[PDB]
Amino acid sequence: ATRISIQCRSCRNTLTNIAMRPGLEGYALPRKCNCPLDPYFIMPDKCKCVDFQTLKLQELPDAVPHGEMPRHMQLYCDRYLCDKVVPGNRVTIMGIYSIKKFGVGVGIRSSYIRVLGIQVDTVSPQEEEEFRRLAALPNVYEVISKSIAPSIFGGTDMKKAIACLLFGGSRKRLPDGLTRRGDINLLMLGDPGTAKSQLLKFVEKCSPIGVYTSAAGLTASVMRDPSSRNFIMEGGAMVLADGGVVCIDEFDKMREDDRVAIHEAMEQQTISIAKAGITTTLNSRCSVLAAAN
Amino acid sequence: DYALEKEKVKKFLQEFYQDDELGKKQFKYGNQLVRLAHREQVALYVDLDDVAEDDPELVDSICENARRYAKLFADAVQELLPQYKQYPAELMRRFELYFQGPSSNKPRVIREVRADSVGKLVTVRGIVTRVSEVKPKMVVATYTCDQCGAETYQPIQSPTFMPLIMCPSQECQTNRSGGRLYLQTRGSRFIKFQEMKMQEHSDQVPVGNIPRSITVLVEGENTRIAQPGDHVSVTGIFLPILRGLLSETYLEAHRIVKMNKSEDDESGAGELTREELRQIAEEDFYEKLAASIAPEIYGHEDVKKALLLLLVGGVDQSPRGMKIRGNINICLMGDPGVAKSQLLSYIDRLAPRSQYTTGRGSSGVGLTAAVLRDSVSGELTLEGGALVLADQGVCCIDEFDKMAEADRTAIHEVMEQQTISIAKAGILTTLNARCSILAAANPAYGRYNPRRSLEQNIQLPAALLSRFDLLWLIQDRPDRDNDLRLAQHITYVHQHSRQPPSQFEPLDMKLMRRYIAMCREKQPMVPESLADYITAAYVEMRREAWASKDATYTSARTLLAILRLSTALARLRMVDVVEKEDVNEAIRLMEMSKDSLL
Amino acid sequence: MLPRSPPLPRGNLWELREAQRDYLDFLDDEEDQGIYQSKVRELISDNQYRLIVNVNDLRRKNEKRANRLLNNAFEELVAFQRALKDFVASIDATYAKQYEEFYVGLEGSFGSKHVSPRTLTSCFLSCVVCVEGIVTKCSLVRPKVVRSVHYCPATKKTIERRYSDLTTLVAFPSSSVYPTKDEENNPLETEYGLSVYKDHQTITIQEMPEKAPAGQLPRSVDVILDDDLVDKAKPGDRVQVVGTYRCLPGKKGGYTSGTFRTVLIACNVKQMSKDAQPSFSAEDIAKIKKFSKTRSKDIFDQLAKSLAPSIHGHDYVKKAILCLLLGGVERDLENGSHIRGDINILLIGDPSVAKSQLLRYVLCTAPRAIPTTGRGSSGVGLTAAVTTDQETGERRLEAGAMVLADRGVVCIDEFDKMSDMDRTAIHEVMEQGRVTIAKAGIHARLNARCSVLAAANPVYGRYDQYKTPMENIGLQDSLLSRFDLLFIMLDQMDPEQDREISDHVLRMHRYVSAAFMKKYIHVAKIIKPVLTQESATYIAEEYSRLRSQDSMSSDTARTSPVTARTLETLIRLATAHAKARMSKTVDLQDAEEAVELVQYAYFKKVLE
DNA sequence: TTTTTTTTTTT
Ligand SMILES: Nc1ncnc2c1ncn2[C@@H]1O[C@H](COP(=O)(O)OP(=O)(O)OP(O)(O)=S)[C@@H](O)[C@H]1O
Ligand SMILES: Nc1ncnc2c1ncn2[C@@H]1O[C@H](COP(=O)(O)OP(=O)(O)O)[C@@H](O)[C@H]1O
Ligand SMILES: [Mg+2]
Ligand SMILES: [Zn+2]
Ligand SMILES: [Zn+2]
Structure with a gap:
């Protein structure tokens, strides 16, 4: 509330146009109506309001004197500074270092920084043609499969196939709603000789969405939460990868339960756990690039 | 206005006739008012269907307000009592008045009673929970000024009240301008009181919704009626709680009726008629009931003969301080699809106090009794299991071979001594659980097979096999023509x-549930002249099962079967002494239970 | 996609005196086409409080008022609801007094007001908005007074009192003192029967997941339902509330922080998703009564052929799955007994025979179908598990899968990767139809009348066609009796079938009516045919011939035992075959349609 | 909204 208006209760006397002060400080309603002691209430119909957020600013990482956890400060944004920054940004605040007035020690106050200035630190038509002509050129196939594994060399078939998984087929819906897959799966069997970890890292890096996994797990779990003392649901990786690609190594190391669930997930393309208090479904839409041993 | 209503109610109270009294037209409330005036009665359940017989208008304006009217009535009777035979007119009440619901209204559910019926006469159905214990609630506080030698009173309405320090008598104040007055718990008046919660039947709830509760303030004479974990129907006003504008509400009970049997409690009308003594006196009364148990099921003429003895139960002795149980336990080992979970579901509904449990969906502490903590108080309390809630009745456990093996030895206690002895870390006690158990199970791996003998296609440790007086064993061998009749x-x-x-017709369930309750309380005896017959029979058994290659483990606990399986029969025939014709019926049963293997 | 109207605009075809005297003129409505005088009467014949208005009409009638109503919603809705009681007294003054006050919802197309809880800024204060999103909690319905009625036992008078709080459209905070002695002389006594209370709830809309920018914790908003709008929303829905926006201040100790809490005083609710198909056209019911009469010979076969065209072969299995989708008739005798009326199907076979496909189709066809696997499902998580609450800390019984799917379908794939201790938790809920739980502090019996469709891979990985049907299935003869139909989807390597199978699937990869089986089965489900003595003597014979081993054959093994439980699966398949014909009396052509299915599903042949 | 001790359901 910025411009507030009150009213008496018994005699119905009004005292309007009262202006609040900015920042985090309230207001002291009278008690001398001119009627019982504090006869004044707020009229909700007549009170102009403005938005306000409240952020939390942590100090840069390269300025901690390196013995402890960085300290942080509290901000107070206003009408047009709200919804301007997202947790994870770098900023430069110009504010009025001040104190809360909502009236460990005897005379201690709280403190914030009333922000009044903020900063942030950092497809095309013609681009379409370098895709068009490249798709149209006669030897369009090998030009990609040549530049998708520079370090590792030998047997371009194992690189020929990987070219398709990055594009994939198309998702069809028959009249019956009986949809069809739109992704592929690959297994690279053979000794672990570290020649394949490079390839996993590459395909993960050059993917629109992609995750390389060896935590919570791959598929969903049901875990007894300390706070709730009850079971909660943990969607793992294959529910976060939407259309993306998931890379896996050492296909015999994954937890027995987890391997069962990944089997069913590649079977049906969704994970549905029916356990203690959990009956949900999570659509798994990703691509499995597995490496065996 | 109400001044003219206090007359239109006195008329009705003094004028009402009734014919079903078995006599001529007497006065239903005419006798009641006399009894109340002679302090031989406390409550006066003014029915509302009877006001709705000559004045269907007053009923409309009662169930509309029901709070003023329940006071006009208690003034009308207050005036009429002296005319038949202290300072405030409420300390000398010594009776209370309750409305018995009008028949035209329909019993709502707890979810239905909304804010549009605050202050009206309602009727709910539910399951009791957390019934408190009786505590004295004050009504008229009596103070005394020890200085001026006087007596003063004040009446209470809220769940709280502020006492007095005045002695407002102007004389005591005027003479001396000083004096305090003490409270006193002699001249005052208390009244019984207990609060209990109700919950919806988890059946009549949306597919996955949480049941809602309501609070019931039973007080006066309705106390000690309802037991926790019970189906009940309540009739009372629906009011808000005193002390911003939102309000929490409770039901103020005026009438409580137990509806365990799915209809009502008819223990008062439970007496039999001479026209039914006709049947009970027939030659083969024992054989009509046997055929009228779950008639939807073809065959099984003998199993139904034993499931009746289980419902009647033998007699229990106590010589030289050595208790012997007087209940019967029965198991129904048999092939799949022979209608065992139908027989059990039927014997569940034909018992006053019954319980149903499944072996694979119940843990061993949930059968007997469990100790559980309250995160609000940190205090451990006891909570009865299935066998406790089924104290004087029957418990039913199907899928009995699939119950976990550590959750099954918690029954050995309840089957012999019929107590439950808990010594966990909050409690140390023995609850009384005098239940008779009836269980069903599949023999070895679903199906009996003739290669392996008994005791290996049954898989019960002898210690538990012997607890069962009758381990009945059913089979189904295909038969070109029996199948035809079954179909x-x-x-x-x-x-x-x-x-x-x-040829004849099965008796109704409602009628058998009474025929049996009348047939329990006989307590026949045993004649000495029979102790030589019985003995020989038992001896013969110990021969066969000792000179055979299939027989089960028989022990000295088998004799008490023959004994307690015959005092049941002799209890059906309404005799008061066991006769040599029932011993042979018992002996035939204990033989027709393993013949299905030969 | 932007929802700029509660009625989806794409396919809808298939002083304070001026306001009060303009609303009345709008509510006349007689002289143009009589749209609202056809609705006031309509609600009086149904005993409703409020009527829904289209602001789209207010625009065409009077633009100035339509704009002044979307920007000063309070002073305009206190004048609308007055000139509505005025207009209902102008039809039936007797009715116009039964109810304390009328209400008026809204619906139509607001220009920029169609906002999400993320865009609902503080420039919409006291302005009709139309918030969309998911409900994520509810409150406990509680009364709330709006008037009292007192009484003086001494003076024989009767005084009243009108109440008002900050959750009204007028907003004066009255005190709930409940006067007991107005004048010190006389005492008072409240009369609850003659007072007036109302309901009150408080729900929390939350932004849709697929509309969040995914970087934050999506925003929320608080709604205050009331006056028989109360139970109109359960957790997990997709609502479109249309209510005024309001800020409600406070003060704790004569000193107010400027910070306020803003709520939405709803005055209409709409479920966005249509979650039923009962709205058949009279043309549709005409088609249905035609099709049900055209040919009674071939309507079942014709129904089943069109069941899952995306699959080749498996005509028997489609027939039986249709029988599932219809169901039998649940008889409950007079004494209280009960006999189930459902069919439980089991399919075993080698990999890649479209089993999972049949399951995923039965899921979408039937309403209220629940999926489940054989490892992501424990024995207790299927039926019911005991837990506690976080706010109260007292135990309760969370419903498993097979209790949510009541009167529905439960699809269990890879039913064989389920441990022995987990199947046993079903034997009660697959035949008796209700789950019984006796845990530590819980004793309950839940209704779970459902039907099971299950798929299991055989032991040895593949069906060894030489061993026997009993050694290829691990299930014991107690569970094998529950499932009344066992289909061995054996895969055969003859070169012919693969040819047409490839043809079919490839044609599918080059892309009776589909949306008609829905209505037809949703209609033919309710019919309840009754046996007749012409067939009841034929079943009572085919069973007694099934039960005799000799009449079967030699070199023929039995997949499952024939008990007195297959007898009343004959009866169920029969009265589920005379439900497609909408026949209402089963005849000898039914009790023979359902016997060959059994003769085929029970006996298998062994090779060497 | 933290430890510590004790009972019972669940992965
Ligand atoms: N003799 C019979 N008379 C009447 N109904 C029968 C008979 N035999 C079987 N039934 C019916 O067949 C079905 C048998 O199911 P249940 O009663 O659950 O079998 P059951 O004895 O419990 O078998 P298990 O132990 O659970 S495998 C029910 O529908 C019964 O009504
Ligand atoms: N008879 C058939 N008709 C149509 N499609 C088939 C048939 N057999 C196999 N398919 C196809 O082959 C795949 C088989 O997978 P599926 O049968 O679901 O595996 P599983 O049998 O292990 O569940 C499916 O994508 C399905 O479309
Ligand atoms: Mg059974
Ligand atoms: Zn004043
Ligand atoms: Zn005195």
Whole structure:
């Protein structure tokens, strides 16, 4: 509330146009109506309001004197500074270092920084043609499969196939709603000789969405939460990868339960756990690039 | 206005006739008012169907307000009492008045009673929970000024009240301008009181919704009626709680009726008629009931003869301080699809106090009794299991071979001594659980097979096998023509939704549930002259099962079967002494229970 | 996609005196086409409080008022609801007094007001908005007074009192003192029967997941339902509330922080998703009564052929799955007994025979179908598990899968990767139809009348066609009796079938009516045919011939035992075959349609 | 909204 208006209760006397002060400080309603002691209430119909957020600013990482956890400060944004920054940004605040007035020690106050200035630190038509002509050129196939594994060399078939998984087929819906897959799966069997970890890292890096996994797990779990003392649901990786690609190594190391669930997930393309208090479904839409041993 | 209503109620109270009294037209409330005036009675359940017989208008304006009217009535009777035979007119009340619901209203559910019926006469159905214990609630506080030698009173309405320090008598104040007055718990008046919660039947809830509760303030005479974990129907006003504008509400009970049997509690009308003594006196009364138990099920003429003894139960002795139980336990080992979970579901509904439990969906502490903590108080309390809630009745456990093996030895205690002795870390006690158990199980791996003998296609440790007086053993071998009759029975059932009419007709469930309760309380004896017959029979058994290659483990606990399986029969025939004809029936049963293997 | 109207605009075809005297003129409505005088009467014949208005009409009638109503919603809705009681007294003054006050919802197309809880800024204060999103909690319905009625036992008078709080459209905070002695002389006594209370709830809308920018914790908003709008929303829905926006201040100790809490005083609710198909056209019911009469010979076969065209072969299995989708008739005798009326199907076979496909189709066809696997499902998580609450800390019984799917379908794939201790938790809920739980502090019996469709891979990985049907299935003869139909989807390597199978699937990869089986089965489900003595003597014979081993054959093994439980699966398949014909009387052509299915599903042949 | 001790359901 910025411009507030009150009213008496018994005699119905009004005292309007009262202006609040900015920042985090309230207001002291009278008690001398001119009627019982504090006869004044707020009229909700007549009170102009403005938005306000409240952020939390942590100090840069390269300025901690390196013995402890960085300290942080509290901000107070206003009408047009709200919804301007997202947790994870770098900023430069110009504010009025001040104190809360909502009236460990005897005379201690709280403190914030009333922000009044903020900063942030950092497809095309013609681009379409370098895709068009490249798709149209006669030897369009090998030009990609040549530049998708520079370090590792030998047997371009194992690189020929990987070219398709990055594009994939198309998702069809028959009249019956009986949809069809739109992704592929690959297994690279053979000794672990570290020649394949490079390839996993590459395909993960050059993917629109992609995750390389060896935590919570791959598929969903049901875990007894300390706070709730009850079971909660943990969607793992294959529910976060939407259309993306998931890379896996050492296909015999994954937890027995987890391997069962990944089997069913590649079977049906969704994970549905029916356990203690959990009956949900999570659509798994990703691509499995597995490496065996 | 109400001044003219206090007359239109006095008329009705002094004028009402009734014919069903078995006599001539007497006065239903005419006798009541005299009894109340002679302090031989406390409550006066003014029915509302009877006001709705000559004045269907007053009923409309009672169930509309029901709070003023329940005071006009208690003033009308207050005036009429002296005319038949201290300072405030409420300390000398010594009676209370309750409305018995009008028949035209329909019993709502707890979810239905909304804010549009605050302050009206309602009727709810539910399951009791957390019934408190009786505590004295004050009504008229009596103070005394020890200085001026006086007596003063004040009446209470809220769940709280502020006492007095005045002695407002102007004389005591005027003479001396000083004096305090003490409270006193002699001249005052208390009244019994207990609060209890109700919950919805988890059946009549949306598919996955949480049941809602309501609070019931039973007080006066309705106390000690309802037991926790019970189906009940309540009739009372629906009011808000005193002390911003939102309000929490409770039901103020005026009438409480137990509806365990799915209809009502008819223990008062439970007496039999001479026209029924006709049947009970017939030659083969024992054989009519046997055929009228779950008639939808063809065959099994003998199993139904034993499931009746289980419902009647033998007699229990106590010589030289050595208790012997007087209940019967029965198991129904048998092949799949022989209608065992139908027989059990039927014996569940034919018992006053019954419980149903499944072996694979119940843990061993949930059968007997469990100690559980309250995160609000940190205090451990006891909570009865299935066998406790089924104290004087029957418990039913199907899927009995699939119950976990550590959750099954918690029954050995309840089957012999019929107590439950808990010594966990909050409690140390022995609850009383005098239940008779009836269980069903599949023999070895679903199906009996003739290669392996008994005791290896049954898989019960002898210690538990011997607890069962009758381990009945059913089989189904295909038969080119018996199957035909079974099918022509079941298809008739699915056509008409009833059983085919035999020579006679099964008795109603409501009537058998009374025939049996009358047949429990006989307590026959045993004649000495029979102790030589019985003995020989028992001896012969110990021979056969000792000179055979299939027989089970028989022990000195088998004799007490023969004994307690015959005092049941002799209890059906309404005799008061066991006769040599029932011993042979018992002996035949204990033989027709393992013949299905030869 | 932007929802700029509660009625989806794409396919809808298939002083304070001026306001009060303009609303009345709008509510006349007689002289143009009589749209609202056809609705006031309509609600009086149904005993409703409020009527829904289209602001789209207010625009065409009077633009100035339509704009002044979307920007000063309070002073305009206190004048609308007055000139509505005025207009209902102008039809039936007797009715116009039964109810304390009328209400008026809204619906139509607001220009920029169609906002999400993320865009609902503080420039919409006291302005009709139309918030969309998911409900994520509810409150406990509680009364709330709006008037009292007192009484003086001494003076025989009767005084009243009108109440008002900050959750009204007028907003004066009255005190709930409940006067007991107005004048010190006489005492008072409240009369609850003659007072007036109302309901009150408080729900929390939350932004849709697929509309969040995914970087934050999506925003929320608080709604205050009331006056028989109360139970109109359960957790997990997709609502479109249309209510005024309001800020409600406070003060704790004569000193107010400027910070306020803003709520939405709803005055209409709409479920966005249509979650039923009962709205058949009279043309549709005409088609249905035609099709049900055209040919009674071939309507079942014709129904089943069109069931899952995306699959080749498996005509028997489609027939039986249709029988599932219809169901039998649940008979409950007079004494209280009960006989189930459902069919439980089991399919075993080698990999890649479209089993999972049949399951995923039965899921979408039937309403209220629940999926489940054989490892992501424990024995207790299927039926019911005991837990506690976080706010109260007292135990309760969370419903498993097979209790949510009541009167529905439960699809269990890879039913064989389920441990022995987990199947046993079903034997009660697959035949008796209700789950019984006796845990530590819980004793309950839940209704779970459902039907099971299950798929299991055989032991040895592949069906060894030489061993026997009993050694290829691990299930014991107690569970094998529950499932009344066992289909061995054996895969055969003859070169012919693969040819047409490839043809079919490839044609599918080059892309009776589909949306008609829905209505037809949703209609033919309710019919309840009754046996007749012409067939009841034929079943009672085919069973007694099934039960005799000799009449079967030699070199023929039995997949499952024939008990007195297959007898009343004959009866169920029969009265589920005379439900497609909408026949209402089963005949000898039914009790023979359902016997060959059994003769085929029970006996298998062994090779060497 | 933290430890510590004790009972019972669940992965
Ligand atoms: N003799 C019979 N009379 C009437 N109904 C029968 C008979 N035999 C079987 N039934 C019916 O067949 C079905 C048998 O199911 P249940 O009663 O659950 O079997 P059960 O004895 O419990 O078998 P298990 O132990 O659970 S495998 C029910 O529908 C019964 O009504
Ligand atoms: N008879 C068939 N008709 C149509 N599609 C088939 C048939 N057999 C196999 N398919 C196809 O082959 C795949 C088989 O997978 P599926 O049968 O679901 O595996 P599983 O049998 O292990 O569940 C499916 O994508 C399905 O479309
Ligand atoms: Mg059973
Ligand atoms: Zn004043
Ligand atoms: Zn005195």
